[PDB]
Amino acid sequence: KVRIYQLAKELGMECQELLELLDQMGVAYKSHASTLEEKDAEAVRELVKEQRGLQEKLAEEERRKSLPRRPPVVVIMGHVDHGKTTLLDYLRKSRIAETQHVGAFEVKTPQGTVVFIDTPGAKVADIAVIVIAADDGIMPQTEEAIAHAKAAGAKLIFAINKIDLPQADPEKVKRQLMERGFVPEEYGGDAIVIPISAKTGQGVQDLLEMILLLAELEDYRADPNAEPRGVILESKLDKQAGIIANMLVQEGTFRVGDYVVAGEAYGRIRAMMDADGNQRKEAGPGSAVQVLGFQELPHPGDVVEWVPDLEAAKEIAEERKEERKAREEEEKARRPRTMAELLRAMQEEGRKELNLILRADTQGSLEAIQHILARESTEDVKINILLAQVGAPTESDVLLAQTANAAILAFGVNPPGSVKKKAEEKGVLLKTFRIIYDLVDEVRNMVKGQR
Ligand SMILES: Nc1nc2c(ncn2[C@@H]2O[C@H](COP(=O)(O)OP(=O)(O)O)[C@@H](O)[C@H]2O)c(=O)[nH]1
């Protein structure tokens, strides 16, 4: 027994909504007063609740999208002397006066502020700026950077340096990328090519505007409250201080007095210093800070977690550890057995036939999946890249695998309607990956012969 209006008062509904529901549920009412059976009592109560939760799912989409934007982190890669140390020096400069490092530094532009790494892994950089000297083109250190970088999922700009000089061939470079598959935006393609100098700092400016654009185009936004998290930039034994650990802040705000955990290493932030020279008791996301008070040396690209108490710190840091020691003995034996199978396991033939195919967003990035893969048939098995091409997949390919038994792997395109469909019904190892690595680590599974 209930009065439609009592129900909407109880639930926290008001009736306009309550009758509206019932007048989709399909249950008679003369007016808001008219009575209901409890079966009714809850027929809404249950059919009211699902929506009510369901809306609080959008709210979180409410917490999610409206979140403040956060400083873009650029890191820089390139060949030993193609202008990296030099262009960084240019970027640090501004507070002329306006210094021990924290692993990163800032440039504050009217358009935005950008973090640029100052280091010698967690995914620490939304972006990479391949430095290619205009003169000596693409030399091995340069390919390695792009490949590795493109596994990061890091967004890449190619910066050309040493152009003030009278012998740079900027085409030579643009071409060199082309043949590779990173084809300039200028040609009609998808790579970003910015002619720069590092001594008069021509191009620096834009490389500033460009990156910001890239930051506008993907709202890189971080919510200060969220459980605080970061990653480990650097770690040292400070001669006077003790254990000192450069961190960059990912989401969350870290406050001195916070308990923290970073792989096997734990502590209580006792202090935090920001590159300026001033102590902070808050670190917001995109904040490179020098943290003091840790009980070990942490390793770089370990995620910094916040913990409420220093006992949870110990538990996680030792939950992590006794798996690693657990590994170790594992090789502490594997290695005693196959380490010496043939010495260099050579007389041993080599033949294992691992076959796969690669379809991609771009060649600019298909020829990075391999570069990485190619270092990596270091096990008894040697893995075959059967056909490589760009794009979404083939049923034949689903058929191809059979002749093949090669597994089909993809990055930057998702499968199609029945290719997943024949893909699956068909006995074929199909994959879709977010990031090229998470394409790659998987490849490691495939050493164990897929059984
Ligand atoms: N001509 C010219 N040379 C440059 C410029 N910027 C840097 N270089 C040169 O690049 C070389 C390598 O710089 P360095 O920072 O030591 O190496 P990297 O950081 O590994 O690229 C230096 O010997 C400089 O002469 C530039 O704008 N023009």
UniProtKB/Swiss-Prot annotation:
Function: One of the essential components for the initiation of protein synthesis. Protects formylmethionyl-tRNA from spontaneous hydrolysis and promotes its binding to the 30S ribosomal subunits. Also involved in the hydrolysis of GTP during the formation of the 70S ribosomal complex.
Chain positions covered by the region annotation G5: 197-199
Keyword Membrane: no
Region of interest (G3), ranges: 118-120
Nucleotide-binding is among the record's keywords: yes
Natural source organism: Thermus thermophilus (strain ATCC 27634 / DSM 579 / HB8)
Protein name: Translation initiation factor IF-2
Membrane spanning stretches: none
Binding site for GTP: 78-85, 118-120, 161-164
Main location: cytoplasm
Alphabetized GO MF terms: GTP binding; GTPase activity; translation initiation factor activity
Chain spans, region G4: 161-164
Region G1, residue ranges: 78-85
UniProt lineage: Bacteria, Thermotogati, Deinococcota, Deinococci, Thermales
Domain tr-type G: 69-220
